[PDB]
Amino acid sequence: SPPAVPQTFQVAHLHAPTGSGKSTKVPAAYAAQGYKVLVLNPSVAATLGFGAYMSKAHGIDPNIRTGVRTITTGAPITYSTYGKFLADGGCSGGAYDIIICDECHSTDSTTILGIGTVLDQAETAGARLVVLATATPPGSVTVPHPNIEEVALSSTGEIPFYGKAIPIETIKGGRHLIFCHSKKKCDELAAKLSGLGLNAVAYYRGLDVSVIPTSGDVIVVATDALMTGFTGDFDSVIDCNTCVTQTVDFSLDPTFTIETTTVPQDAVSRSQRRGRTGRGRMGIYRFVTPGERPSGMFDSSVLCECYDAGCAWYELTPAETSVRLRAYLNTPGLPVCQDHLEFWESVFTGLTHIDAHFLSQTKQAGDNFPYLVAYQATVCARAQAPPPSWDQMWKCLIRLKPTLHGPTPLLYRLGAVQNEVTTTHPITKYIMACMSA
Amino acid sequence: SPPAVPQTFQVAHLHAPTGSGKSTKVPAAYAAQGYKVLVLNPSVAATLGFGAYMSKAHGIDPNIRTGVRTITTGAPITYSTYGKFLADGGCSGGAYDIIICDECHSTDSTTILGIGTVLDQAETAGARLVVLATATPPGSVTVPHPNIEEVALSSTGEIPFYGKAIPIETIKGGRHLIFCHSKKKCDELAAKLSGLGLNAVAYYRGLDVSVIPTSGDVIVVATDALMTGFTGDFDSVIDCNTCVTQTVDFSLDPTFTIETTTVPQDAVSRSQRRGRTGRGRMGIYRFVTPGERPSGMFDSSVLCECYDAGCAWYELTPAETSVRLRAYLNTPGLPVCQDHLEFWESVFTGLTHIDAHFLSQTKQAGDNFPYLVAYQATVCARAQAPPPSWDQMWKCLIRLKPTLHGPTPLLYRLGAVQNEVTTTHPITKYIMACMSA
Amino acid sequence: SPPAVPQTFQVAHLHAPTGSGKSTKVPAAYAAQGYKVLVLNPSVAATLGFGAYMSKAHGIDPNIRTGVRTITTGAPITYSTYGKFLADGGCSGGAYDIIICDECHSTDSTTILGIGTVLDQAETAGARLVVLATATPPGSVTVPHPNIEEVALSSTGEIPFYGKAIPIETIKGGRHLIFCHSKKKCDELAAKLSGLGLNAVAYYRGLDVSVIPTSGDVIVVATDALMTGFTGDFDSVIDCNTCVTQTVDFSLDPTFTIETTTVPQDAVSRSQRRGRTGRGRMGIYRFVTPGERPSGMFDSSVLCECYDAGCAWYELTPAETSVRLRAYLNTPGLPVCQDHLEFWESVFTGLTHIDAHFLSQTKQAGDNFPYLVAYQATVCARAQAPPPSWDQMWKCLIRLKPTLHGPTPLLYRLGAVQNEVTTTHPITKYIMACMSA
DNA sequence: TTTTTTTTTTTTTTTTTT
C-alpha cells in the first residue's frame, strides 16, 4: 500500500482504515529502508503518543516536536504537529527524504496551512516523497470497521445525553471515551459522572494531556481534541454526533459575518470519532443519531481563518499565506473549497498596525479569529469608541470603558452587536470595496 | 406558612407577598431540617443573586446553575434557572427531597416546560415535596404592599415617558429601576439619562448582569428581564405599565398567524414589577397608567412556544413535550390555558429535517419561535424560493438571494409577507389538515 | 438666502429649488457659525441618506434618528424624521439653537403634527431660530428646473404604463426611478422589468432602504416613499402623474365617510417627484400627463388623520394634538386647511378604552386610520356584532366570527359596508351630535 | 371583474472545537 520512494519529487496518497498503522508502521517501514521521515499530525495528544509507543513497540525513539514538548534523539523519524512545524519556519534544507502529511482530512486552518506549506517547499527542500495519509479521503462515505460494533443509544439510562441516555453499566469499569461538542458539556458531564463513583476526566484544547491515565478504568469526556490520530486504548466510544463549525456570510451589513454554529457531524467526523476505539482490538461505538452529511468541501471561513492564523501565529504575510493555500487548492485528492484567496488576501492586507497588546490578549484567551477580534479592538480604541458589545470577546477594552464613547466603527460581524454602529471607517469602506469587486 | 414535608409525594402551594423571603428564608428553613432543596427560578439575574446573598446573609454557599455560571459547593441548597434545569435533563435520581418551583406565575415557555417537567418526574425521582411558590397566584388581584408607596407620574418633568414625564429630582441620586416594554426604548432612555449627568445603564436578555452595580447611585432601564425574583436594592421603580405579548390567530390564510403586540400589563406584571422595590425596606413605585387586566389565563401561543423551545433548545420530541405540558395543565393552582396540546403536537411532529445551520442562526439571533422561523427558511431554500419578505427575520437566506425565485411556500405567518405566496407545499397542506380536525 | 440667527425667537422661511442644498449645505453653514442644528425630514430614506453623504462630502458625521436606526456621534447637526421626533417626546431643553422643519410642503399627518409641535415648543425649549424649508411653498406653480429636461412619453414602447408606454432603450443601462401610485403596480412593473434582463427593484413604506444599490445600473419602481428629500443619483425619472389621496365626506349616514381615491398629482407632487433627478447634474423627466392641479390647501381628512396618529402612535391626547395643530394653522406660510380642530377633537375624545390587541394589529398591518379601524372593531366585539364587512381591513375580528351576530354598530364609514347596520350605538349618537353643532 | 401613499413599531430562559 505505501507509495514507493521515487527518484524525483512526487506527491502520493495513502488511504487505510483507522488504526491500521498509517502513522506508525508505515513511517517505520520507510526508516527501515534508510530514509529520513517527517510525520506531521494535527493532534498534540497523538504526536506525544507516538513518542512513547514507537519507543516500546518499534524500538525507535523518534524526535518529537510540539508546543508542549521537544525531544531530539537523532532518530530517522520525526513526529511533529502542523502547528509546531509552521512555528519552526517550515521545511529544512535536506532535512528529510519523505514528508508524511498525516490526517490530511483535517480542515482546520493550521493543518491546511501546514500541508500547503509542505506541498510548496518539499521538493525545493530536497524531499523525494510527500505522502497525504488519512482513513477518510475527501469524497468518501462511512464504511464498516471490522473491530467496531455500532450500538445506538436509547432513552433508557440514568445519564441524560443529547436527547438520549447513557446506561451506567455501559461505562462502569473499563476505558471509555465520550465526545461532546463543547467544553461546557465536557465539564458538566465529567462532573455528573465523577459524582457517581466513576473515574471521570474532561479533556480539550487548553488542558494537559497528562490528565488521561495510561491505564486503569477511566472515562474521558472530550471535544474533537481527541478526534484524530489519538490512541487511548478505549473499550468504547459514545458520540453525540454533533460538532461546532464556522460559516462566513457576506451580508454586506456592512461587510461580512462570521457565525459559529452547532451542526450534525459529517462522515469524516463520524469515522474519525468512531475510530478512537477498535484500535488493535474489538471495540464498541454508541451514538445518538445515525447517518451523517457528506464531506469533501469546506467553508470559505476556513480560508479566512488561515490568513488570520498566518498573521497572528506564524509570522506569515497575507501574500505568503496565499502562496501556501494555492499549493493546497491546486493539489488533487484534498478537500476542495471556493477559491476566495484573492479576496481574503486583500482583506487582511489592509489590516495593518494592529495593537500588539490586544493581539496577545485574544491569542491567550483562545478566541477564534484572534487577529480580526484584536484588529476591531484596535480600531475602536483609536477612535475612542466602544466595542460591538460588552461580552467576554471584547474584555481587552473594558479597561478603557470610561473614555470610549459614540458609535462602534464596525469592521465586520464576529458576534452580537449591541452598541450603535457607524460604517464610515476607512477599513470598513476598504473591506466593502474588496467585496464589490 | 411553608408546607410541611410529607412522608409520601405531594405538591403544595406557597403564597406570600414580594420580598417576604419565599426564595431565600423558606429554602433555608428546609435545609435546616436536614433536607436537600432545589430552587428553580426563571431569572438568571435572580439566580446568580441568590448565590452572593445566601452567602453573606445565611452563611450557606449554595450550588448555582445557569447558562452563564455554575458553582458546585456541595451545599444542601441548589438554585437553578428553569432553562438550565431543562438543558441538564431534568430531575436527577434521588438528587433532592424538595423541589421548589419558584415564581410559578411566569407564563414563558421555559417556566411552563420546566414546571411541567418537575410535576412529571419529581415523585419518580424520589422527591417528597414539590412547592409552587409565587406572590401573585393565578386568579389574584393586586393588593397593597406595606413597604411601597404608589405615586402616579404627571406631565411635569423634563424626561418624556410613555405620555407622561419623569422629574429629574425624582431619580437624581439613589438607586432606581425603570421598566420599558422594549430594548429599543431601554437604550434611548438610558442614553437620554446618561447625557444628563446620571449614572444610567440599560439591561435586558442578552446583556451581562455585571452592568448593574452592587451599590452606589444608579438608574437601571430594563425590560421584564428584571421583572421577577430579582433584588437590586432599589429606592424606587417607575413602570410604563405596558408589556409585549404574543397571540396566535387561526386565520386559515393558509394556516395560523403569530402576532406580537404591545398591550397593558396584567395584575401579575404590575405586582411583580412593583415588587422590585420595597424589598426589606420602604420604597416608591411610580406609574403611567393605573389599574390593570386580570390574570390566570395565557394564550395558546405560549403552548406553541413550548413545543418550539423543546425542539430548538431542550432536545425534546413533540410527544415528550406533551407529556410535560399535560402534567402542568392537569395540576390545580396554576395558570390555565386552552387545551391545544394535540393540535400543536401534531403540527411540530410534521416539521422534520430542519436545516441545522438555519436553526442555529435563529437561536443566536434571539428570534421568537426560532424553530418555526428556521423551518420556513428550510422549506424555502429547498424550493429555491424566497422567504416571506426580506426583513431581518429572514437574513439567514439573503446569502441565497441570487438563486431563490418564485412564490414563497408560506407555512404560516410569523410577520409581514411581501413576496407572492403559494399554499400548495406538503407541510402547508399538512398544517391546514391539522386545523380542519 | 438662509435666515440669519436672531437674538430672540423667530420663525423664518427658506425657499430654493430641488437639489440646491437646503437639507445639506444650509444646516452645515449654520453649524460652521457654532450653532447646534436639528433637521427634521419626513423621509426615512432621505434622513439615513444624509448620514453617509454629510460624512464624505462635508466631513461631519451627524447624529441620525429614525425608527430603523440611531447614531449618536455628538456632532452639532442632527437629522431626524418627524416620526422619530414625535416618538421621542418632541423638543429637548436647550438641545438646539436652530430647528429646521425640512420639506414643510408635506401634508401627511406626521409632518403636520411634527411641525406644529416644533412651532409650539421651540422658543420654550430655547431655540432661537425655526426654519420652514421647501422647494415648493404653499401657493406656488411648477417652475422650470435648469438641470431637468422634461420629455413626455408616447404610445411607442414595449412596456405599458398608465395609458402610455416606456421604451426599453430609455431605461436600459444607467440609474432610473419610476413612480407608481400604488405598491401593487410597483410590484408588477418591477417584475415585468426584471423579467426582461433589467436590474429592477421595488420600494415603498415597509421595505428596507438597502434594496436600493448605492451605485451601478438600477431601476427603482416606487411610491411617494421616494418623493421628497431623497437623492438616489438617478439619470432620469418617469412619473405616472397620479397619486393616492384621502377625503372625508360628512354624509350623515350615520356620521362621516373617509374615502381613499386615486387622482391627478398636484404641483407640489410634480415638482418634488421631478426633483428626484437633476440633483447636482443634468437629468431627464418623463411623464404621462402634462400640467397639474394647484396646491396650498389640504383636506379636513388630514386633520382627522393627525388625531388618529396622535392617539395610536405618539401617546398624545386629542387636547394635546389640538394645541399642536393650532400652532401649525396659525403660522403664516404653510399649507392651509378648514379649521375643524374642535370637531375632530371632540370626536376622538369620545373614543376611549380601545382594545389594545386590535390597535396593535391595525398599526402593524399598515392600515390607514389604525385607531378608527381598531375602535370600530372594539365596539363590534363588545356588542358581539360583526364588522362592516369581512375584508382584510377587519381580519382582526375573523377570530370571533362564530360568536358575532346581528347588525353592525356602524360608527362611521371607512370602506364598503356589506352587513346589516344599526345606528343606535352611544358612540354613533355621540359622533352625530358632534356634527349637528 | 379592473381597485388604496406617506412617517411612528417586538419580552422572557436554554447557547461556540479545532
Ligand SMILES: Nc1ncnc2c1ncn2[C@@H]1O[C@H](COP(=O)(O)OP(=O)(O)O)[C@@H](O)[C@H]1O
Ligand atoms: N499511542 C499508542 N498507544 C497504544 N497503542 C498504539 C498507540 N499508537 C498506535 N498504537 C497501535 O498501533 C495501531 C496503529 O496505530 P496508528 O498508526 O496510529 O493508526 P492509524 O492508521 O490510525 O494512523 C493501533 O491499532 C494501535 O493498536
Ligand SMILES: Nc1ncnc2c1ncn2[C@@H]1O[C@H](COP(=O)(O)OP(=O)(O)O)[C@@H](O)[C@H]1O
Ligand atoms: N440578592 C439580594 N440582595 C439584597 N437583598 C436580598 C437579596 N435577595 C434577597 N434579599 C432580601 O431578602 C428578602 C427576601 O427576598 P426573596 O426571598 O428573594 O423574596 P421573595 O419572597 O420575593 O421570593 C428581601 O426583601 C431582601 O431584603
Ligand SMILES: Nc1ncnc2c1ncn2[C@@H]1O[C@H](COP(=O)(O)OP(=O)(O)O)[C@@H](O)[C@H]1O
Ligand atoms: N445622499 C446623497 N447622495 C448623493 N448626493 C447628495 C446626497 N444628498 C445630497 N446630495 C447632493 O447635494 C445636493 C443638495 O442636496 P439636498 O440638500 O438634499 O437638496 P435640497 O435642496 O433638495 O434639500 C444635491 O444636488 C446632490 O448633488
Ligand code: BEF
Ligand atoms: F486513521 Be488513524 F485513526 F489515524
Ligand code: BEF
Ligand atoms: F415574590 Be418575590 F418578589 F420573588
Ligand code: BEF
Ligand atoms: F428640495 Be429638495 F429636493 F429637498
Ligand SMILES: [Mn+2]
Ligand atoms: Mn494516524
Ligand SMILES: [Mn+2]
Ligand atoms: Mn422569589
Ligand SMILES: [Mn+2]
Ligand atoms: Mn431637502
